[PDB]
Design an enzyme around this catalytic site. Structure first.
Site, mmCIF file in Angstrom:
data_model
loop_
_atom_site.group_PDB
_atom_site.id
_atom_site.type_symbol
_atom_site.label_atom_id
_atom_site.label_comp_id
_atom_site.label_asym_id
_atom_site.label_seq_id
_atom_site.Cartn_x
_atom_site.Cartn_y
_atom_site.Cartn_z
ATOM 1 N N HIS A 84 -20.187 34.254 -27.896
ATOM 2 C CA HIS A 84 -21.328 34.799 -28.642
ATOM 3 C C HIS A 84 -22.395 33.716 -28.701
ATOM 4 O O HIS A 84 -22.239 32.634 -28.128
ATOM 5 C CB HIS A 84 -20.983 35.433 -29.967
ATOM 6 N N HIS A 86 -23.856 31.810 -31.150
ATOM 7 C CA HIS A 86 -23.962 30.720 -32.104
ATOM 8 C C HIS A 86 -23.679 29.380 -31.427
ATOM 9 O O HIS A 86 -23.086 29.304 -30.339
ATOM 10 C CB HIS A 86 -22.997 30.969 -33.277
ATOM 11 N N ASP A 88 -21.607 27.007 -31.970
ATOM 12 C CA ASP A 88 -20.218 26.670 -31.677
ATOM 13 C C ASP A 88 -19.720 27.303 -30.373
ATOM 14 O O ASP A 88 -18.590 27.031 -29.966
ATOM 15 C CB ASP A 88 -19.283 26.974 -32.841
ATOM 16 N N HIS A 149 -17.814 39.679 -36.113
ATOM 17 C CA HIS A 149 -18.472 38.458 -36.566
ATOM 18 C C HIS A 149 -19.942 38.424 -36.139
ATOM 19 O O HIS A 149 -20.800 37.916 -36.867
ATOM 20 C CB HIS A 149 -17.715 37.281 -35.949
ATOM 21 N N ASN A 180 -18.642 32.496 -41.712
ATOM 22 C CA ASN A 180 -20.083 32.710 -41.734
ATOM 23 C C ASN A 180 -20.399 34.116 -41.243
ATOM 24 O O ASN A 180 -20.308 34.404 -40.046
ATOM 25 C CB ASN A 180 -20.777 31.644 -40.891
HETATM 26 C C1 XZL Z 1 -21.706 28.056 -35.738
HETATM 27 C C2 XZL Z 1 -22.182 28.863 -36.983
HETATM 28 O O1 XZL Z 1 -23.551 28.681 -37.027
HETATM 29 C C3 XZL Z 1 -24.328 29.712 -37.591
HETATM 30 C C4 XZL Z 1 -23.855 30.987 -37.890
HETATM 31 C C5 XZL Z 1 -24.705 31.917 -38.464
HETATM 32 C C6 XZL Z 1 -26.017 31.584 -38.733
HETATM 33 C C7 XZL Z 1 -26.943 32.630 -39.364
HETATM 34 N N1 XZL Z 1 -28.319 32.440 -38.955
HETATM 35 C C8 XZL Z 1 -26.496 30.324 -38.436
HETATM 36 C C9 XZL Z 1 -25.647 29.392 -37.867
HETATM 37 C C10 XZL Z 1 -21.368 28.336 -38.180
HETATM 38 C C11 XZL Z 1 -21.743 27.213 -38.909
HETATM 39 C C12 XZL Z 1 -20.938 26.769 -39.974
HETATM 40 C C13 XZL Z 1 -19.745 27.402 -40.306
HETATM 41 C C14 XZL Z 1 -19.355 28.542 -39.565
HETATM 42 C C15 XZL Z 1 -18.254 29.421 -39.633
HETATM 43 C C16 XZL Z 1 -17.075 29.323 -40.586
HETATM 44 C C17 XZL Z 1 -17.219 29.139 -41.936
HETATM 45 C C18 XZL Z 1 -16.094 29.023 -42.731
HETATM 46 C C19 XZL Z 1 -14.812 29.072 -42.205
HETATM 47 C C20 XZL Z 1 -13.601 28.930 -43.125
HETATM 48 S S1 XZL Z 1 -13.030 30.523 -43.794
HETATM 49 C C21 XZL Z 1 -12.782 31.646 -42.399
HETATM 50 O O2 XZL Z 1 -11.762 30.423 -44.515
HETATM 51 O O3 XZL Z 1 -13.990 31.045 -44.770
HETATM 52 C C22 XZL Z 1 -14.661 29.231 -40.833
HETATM 53 F F1 XZL Z 1 -13.429 29.283 -40.233
HETATM 54 C C23 XZL Z 1 -15.793 29.349 -40.035
HETATM 55 C C24 XZL Z 1 -18.433 30.330 -38.600
HETATM 56 C C25 XZL Z 1 -17.594 31.514 -38.244
HETATM 57 O O4 XZL Z 1 -17.170 32.202 -39.229
HETATM 58 O O5 XZL Z 1 -17.435 31.858 -37.044
HETATM 59 N N2 XZL Z 1 -19.559 30.053 -37.964
HETATM 60 C C26 XZL Z 1 -20.157 28.980 -38.520
HETATM 61 ZN ZN ZN Z 2 -17.629 30.624 -35.253
HETATM 62 ZN ZN ZN Z 3 -20.414 32.659 -34.773
#
Ligand code: XZL
Ligand code: ZN
Ligand code: ZN
Length: 231
Positions: A84, A86, A88, A149, A180
């Site tokens: 996707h 983002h 990461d 997601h 996120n």
């Molecule tokens: C890489 C991503 O960038 C962004 C994503 C959205 C936006 C909106 N414009 C901007 C930048 C990003 C940046 C920072 C964090 C994330 C997380 C994340 C968050 C928390 C947990 C722990 S948990 C499931 O227990 O809650 C986890 F596993 C993953 C995820 C994801 O969910 O894929 N993506 C993240």
């Molecule tokens: Zn992610």
């Molecule tokens: Zn993502």
């Protein structure tokens, strides 16, 4: 030998984990909005070459990923797919492209990455625009489950090993929140997970976008945490 976590991964280094014969995950850490997170990708042997799934979340992390692959595996990465838009998943695509790796993503991912100001894979993956679509790409199948997601999220199956890489549409078992969700479709996500479950009932290892691999239970757990997040 345990699955690597941030406590073993300073931001900037990368570790590999052998999942099955010819299948590794890659693990790196990155800071975002003042917090540190792990994230996973996949490496799949493709004869005497390698297919990479997802960057290591950043240019320097992705350079470190290529060096770690050379040290641990020693076969060239020739192609990469980003699952996707983002950072990461695409952050580091410019590093890959300057290292001779051909970079791919769906047209939906490419458009979203371009609009967001993220790095843009070079090549478009057609045949994935409707939920339930699948295409072959080297030693994997790419599958579009529907919005979860993100609207563009792809999952990857390695049929030789029954490995399901869910990417960020799948969460680890210890998760208490759906990550996120800014770009997510929480109402559609369980339906998309149900499509994954129906399509890959023989998966033996399920790898989330962040955190520890497990079995098929990660899929139901993800649906559960998403439904509770929505509510
Ligand atoms: C890489 C991503 O960038 C962004 C994503 C959205 C936006 C909106 N414009 C901007 C930048 C990003 C940046 C920072 C964090 C994330 C997380 C994340 C968050 C928390 C947990 C722990 S948990 C499931 O227990 O809650 C986890 F596993 C993953 C995820 C994801 O969910 O894929 N993506 C993240
Ligand atoms: Zn992610
Ligand atoms: Zn993502």
């Amino acid at each position: 030998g345990e699955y690597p976590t941030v406590n073993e991964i300073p931001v900037g280094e990368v570790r590999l984990y052998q999942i099955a014969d010819g299948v590794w995950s890659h693990i790196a850490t990155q800071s975002f909005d003042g917090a540190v997170y792990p994230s996973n990708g996949l490496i799949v042997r493709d004869g005497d070459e390698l297919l990479l799934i997802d960057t290591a979340w950043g240019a320097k992390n992705t350079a470190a990923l290529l060096a770690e692959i050379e040290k641990q595996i020693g076969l060239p990465v020739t192609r990469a797919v980003s699952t996707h838009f983002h950072d990461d998943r695409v952050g580091g695509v410019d590093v890959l492209r300057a290292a001779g790796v051909a970079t791919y993503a769906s047209p939906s991912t490419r458009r979203l990455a371009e609009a967001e100001g993220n790095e843009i894979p070079t090549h478009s993956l057609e045949g994935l625009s409707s939920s339930g679509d699948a295409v072959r790409f080297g030693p994997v199948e790419l599958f579009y489950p529907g919005a979860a997601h993100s609207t563009d999220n792809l999952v990857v199956y390695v049929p030789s090993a029954n490995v399901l890489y869910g990417g960020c549409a799948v969460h680890e078992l210890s998760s208490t929140s759906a990550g996120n969700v800014a770009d997510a479709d929480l109402a559609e996500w369980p339906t998309s997970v149900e499509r994954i479950q129906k399509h890959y009932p023989e998966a033996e290892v399920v790898i989330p976008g962040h955190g520890l691999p497990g079995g098929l239970d990660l899929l139901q757990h993800t649906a559960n945490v998403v439904k509770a997040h929505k509510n």
